[PDB]
Amino acid sequence: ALKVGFWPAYSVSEFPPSKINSRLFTHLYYAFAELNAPTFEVRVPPGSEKTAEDFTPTVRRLNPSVKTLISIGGWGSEVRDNFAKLNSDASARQRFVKSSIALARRYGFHGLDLDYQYPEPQLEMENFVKLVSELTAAIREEARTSGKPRLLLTEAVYFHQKLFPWEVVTEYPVQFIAAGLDWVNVMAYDFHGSWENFTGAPAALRDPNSKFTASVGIESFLAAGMPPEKLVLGIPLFGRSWLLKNNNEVGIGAPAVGAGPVDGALSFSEIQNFIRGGAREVFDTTTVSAYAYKDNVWVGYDNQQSVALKVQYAKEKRLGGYFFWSVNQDIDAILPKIASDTWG
Numbered sequence: 001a002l003k004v005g006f007w008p009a010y011s012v013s014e015f016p017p018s019k020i021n022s023r024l025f026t027h028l029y030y031a032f033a034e035l036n037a038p039t040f041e042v043r044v045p046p047g048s049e050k051t052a053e054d055f056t057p058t059v060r061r062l063n064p065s066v067k068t069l070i071s072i073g074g075w076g077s078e079v080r081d082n083f084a085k086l087n088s089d090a091s092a093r094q095r096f097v098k099s100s101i102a103l104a105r106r107y108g109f110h111g112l113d114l115d116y117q118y119p120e121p122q123l124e125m126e127n128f129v130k131l132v133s134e135l136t137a138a139i140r141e142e143a144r145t146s147g148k149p150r151l152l153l154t155e156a157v158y159f160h161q162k163l164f165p166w167e168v169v170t171e172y173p174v175q176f177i178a179a180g181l182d183w184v185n186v187m188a189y190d191f192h193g194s195w196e197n198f199t200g201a202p203a204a205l206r207d208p209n210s211k212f213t214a215s216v217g218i219e220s221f222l223a224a225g226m227p228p229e230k231l232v233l234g235i236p237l238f239g240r241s242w243l244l245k246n247n248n249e250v251g252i253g254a255p256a257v258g259a260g261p262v263d264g265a266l267s268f269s270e271i272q273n274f275i276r277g278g279a280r281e282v283f284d285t286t287t288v289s290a291y292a293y294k295d296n297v298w299v300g301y302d303n304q305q306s307v308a309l310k311v312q313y314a315k316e317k318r319l320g321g322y323f324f325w326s327v328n329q330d331i332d333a334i335l336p337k338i339a340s341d342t343w344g
Ligand SMILES: CC(=O)N[C@@H]1[C@@H](O)[C@H](O)[C@@H](CO)O[C@H]1O
Pocket: 159, 189, 190, 191, 192, 195, 212
């Protein structure tokens, strides 16, 4: 049973690793190491070496049996473009594989994660396969030479097995992945947000009149032949916010006029403050989700109830477990506790 949390190093000032309740997790990820083009000598951001080093011993103080992984990449065009440059260059791939393994070992991480959004189109998937093929070979060789247990290898995946459901240009090679990776982190969120001019459930578990749901995505990996234990269901600890066109239209599907605070996203903790400050919270049973609104601000997120429901779902579907992005966004570890209690 995998209980996974992502900690972003950029949150270090407001939420250092010591604040993580690691008793609620089996694995904690450090996000993110840099690809560092053009050499592709992977590294943590220069000047953060101490933070990277202290991460694992720190989180193990509260839970000595917790394991850690370091994630390489992240979202955005720069990371995507750098993966694309890297994967097409055999020499660069060799430098990446060598430096990534060294990076994990340097700081005492138990594994590596690749966060590439996204390996499309077909050429990019094929070249990513080359990278992972070489990385897995090196991981096994490093275990034999060192006498240590091999590093874990995971990767972030789109909510759906096809890239993309509406226009398929490539797809995740599920048998390759099941063979080479310990698990995948399914990003079952950001289905809806301020890029749309209507409010919606940003991480809907299901929806009777929509294909953008966690369940539809999970079903697609399972249909493709992925062993269910290889799938780890992502749950956001943030919500997507909109500014309402009309303050008296406050339900799902209400017209909107742009991103709410802060640039279209609020942490769960910020959403708690929003409610304590007068916002009305609604649970939407149709989508298995929450939303909250006050004046012209509307936010959709996962709450205590929807998280319990999503974790039970993951158990029903026989998944490997769940992950949260990102742990700094729930300062009192409200949702990680509910999730851990639900699975146990
Ligand atoms: C489920 C999905 O694909 N969601 C994406 C979202 O991640 C992205 O931020 C947005 C804006 O480009 O476009 C959506 O289609």
